[PDB]
Amino acid sequence: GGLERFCSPGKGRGLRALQPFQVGDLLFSCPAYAYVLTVNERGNHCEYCFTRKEGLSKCGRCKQAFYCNVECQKEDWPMHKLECSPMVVFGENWNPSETVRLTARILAKQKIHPERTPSEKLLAVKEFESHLDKLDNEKKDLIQSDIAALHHFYSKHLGFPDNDSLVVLFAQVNCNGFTIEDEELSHLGSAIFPDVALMNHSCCPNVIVTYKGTLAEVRAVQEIKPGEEVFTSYIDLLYPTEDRNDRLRDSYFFTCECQECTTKDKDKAKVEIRKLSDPPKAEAIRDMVRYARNVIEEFRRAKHYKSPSELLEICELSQEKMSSVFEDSNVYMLHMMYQAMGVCLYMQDWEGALQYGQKIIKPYSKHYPLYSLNVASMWLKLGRLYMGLEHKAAGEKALKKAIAIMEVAHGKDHPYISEIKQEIESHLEH
Ligand SMILES: Nc1ncnc2c1ncn2[C@@H]1O[C@H](CSCC[C@H](N)C(=O)O)[C@@H](O)[C@H]1O
Ligand SMILES: [Zn+2]
Ligand SMILES: [Zn+2]
Ligand SMILES: [Zn+2]
């Protein structure tokens, strides 16, 4: 559109604006080059168009793929053929990672479509940065076993290029891949959007990437002047600059140097220390931060095998131990609270979930930017929890605060905004 590919010094390739864009303006949308629905969302969402419905039909062989109707099934078949039969043959042992699943889809799409797609207008998949020189042995070994898994499960319908070519491609996916989220930032699947991948990172982004099914769309969250580069955020903005740049060095191989990262303006309020008699020493804070970043990692591993009680305990005991130094507005406090809310939501313990939600909504607003999907998503969860617990007045308020951010982020007309407005109306009469 009114945009340009250029060389951003120290940032590689980037997107710059040829015209002014106001807050909420659509920069462009980009269709998905390749995409997959997560194993867990099978049945809830159409495998093809990513539409959440309760009346889906399944395949007459695998029974593991679900579609709106015949039309969605035929259109998805070239991609689904890759698994339908292997899911029957390997049955119990069918466990390729979502990266493998996605990479398969890319390789299939390259074979049936060697020419530049309408998804690669400025950046091509084959032009993706790979950072092969910066990868340690661990990552190279992960990639290697990804290749074997792909050979294992996908040999019956795909023809593989040489090993060294797949190494490049897998590195490209880990560096340019997108995850698709729904309203409540729930993980729907993985996808490639080559044109959106062109945008660089700021922890002060001027755009937001949103989704309308399998279509990605990019809207301005700040006034963009002609000549300015267009930035999204690759990461969750809640965390301190060090926690942020730790993730950026490890997954994308750079240190961010935007205004936020250079001045650390919001770092103090994020790691809020309890103001009290005998102010905790720099050593006791350094210890608790390490404990926090540590227990977060512990929890991430635990939530894949531990029971809800065990996970609730982790959240409770860590909250307790951190309480001695950290306020409730502290980011590491919010995290464990947010996790505990996840486990309450799993256990149909709606009242519990709501309490955690109330205790984390305000600090969220202070820590995130004004237009932030995390905030809107939290508002939405609160709105539906309130609304289901007979709190219609607080529910509507929370739902309207969601719409306020989403109108700018998703666009006034987004099917998500229709749903929310419809959830509001379902409780009133006029
Ligand atoms: N704020 C930033 N500072 C430096 N490099 C960045 C950056 N944001 C993104 N990058 C670089 O861009 C990659 C993400 S893909 C973005 C397109 C990329 N600039 C390209 O030339 O193809 C990252 O791996 C990183 O190397
Ligand atoms: Zn469909
Ligand atoms: Zn099938
Ligand atoms: Zn930054």
Curated annotation (Swiss-Prot):
SET domain mapped to chain residues: 1-235
Catalytic activity: L-lysyl(4)-[histone H3] + 3 S-adenosyl-L-methionine = N(6),N(6),N(6)-trimethyl-L-lysyl(4)-[histone H3] + 3 S-adenosyl-L-homocysteine + 3 H(+); L-lysyl-[protein] + S-adenosyl-L-methionine = N(6)-methyl-L-lysyl-[protein] + S-adenosyl-L-homocysteine + H(+)
Glycosyltransferase as UniProt keyword: no
GO molecular function term, any single one: zinc ion binding
Binding-site residues for Zn(2+) 1, renumbered to this chain: 46, 49, 68, 72
Residue positions, PTM Phosphoserine: 277
Effect after changing residue 247 to Q: No effect on methyltransferase activity on p53/TP53
UniProt GO BP: heart development; negative regulation of cell population proliferation; negative regulation of transcription by RNA polymerase II; peptidyl-lysine dimethylation; peptidyl-lysine monomethylation; regulation of DNA damage response, signal transduction by p53 class mediator; regulation of signal transduction by p53 class mediator
Outcome (variant: residue 246 to R): Slightly reduces methyltransferase activity on p53/TP53
EC assignment: 2.1.1.-, 2.1.1.354
Consequence recorded when altering residue 201 to A: Abolishes methyltransferase activity
GO cellular component: cytoplasm; cytosol; nucleoplasm; nucleus
InterPro entries xrefs: H3K4_H4K5_MeTrfase, SET_dom, SET_dom_sf, SMYD2_SET, TPR-like_helical_dom_sf, Znf_MYND
Annotated effect of mutating residue 181 to K: Abolishes methyltransferase activity on p53/TP53
Quaternary structure note: Interacts with RNA polymerase II and HELZ. Interacts with SIN3A and HDAC1. Interacts (via MYND-type zinc finger) with EPB41L3. Interacts (via SET domain) with p53/TP53. Interacts with RB1 and HSP90AA1.
Protein family membership: Belongs to the class V-like SAM-binding methyltransferase superfamily.
Function: Protein-lysine N-methyltransferase that methylates both histones and non-histone proteins, including p53/TP53 and RB1. Specifically trimethylates histone H3 'Lys-4' (H3K4me3) in vivo. The activity requires interaction with HSP90alpha. Shows even higher methyltransferase activity on p53/TP53. Monomethylates 'Lys-370' of p53/TP53, leading to decreased DNA-binding activity and subsequent transcriptional regulation activity of p53/TP53. Monomethylates RB1 at 'Lys-860'.
Protein name: N-lysine methyltransferase SMYD2
Organism: Homo sapiens
Organism classification: Eukaryota, Metazoa, Chordata, Craniata, Vertebrata
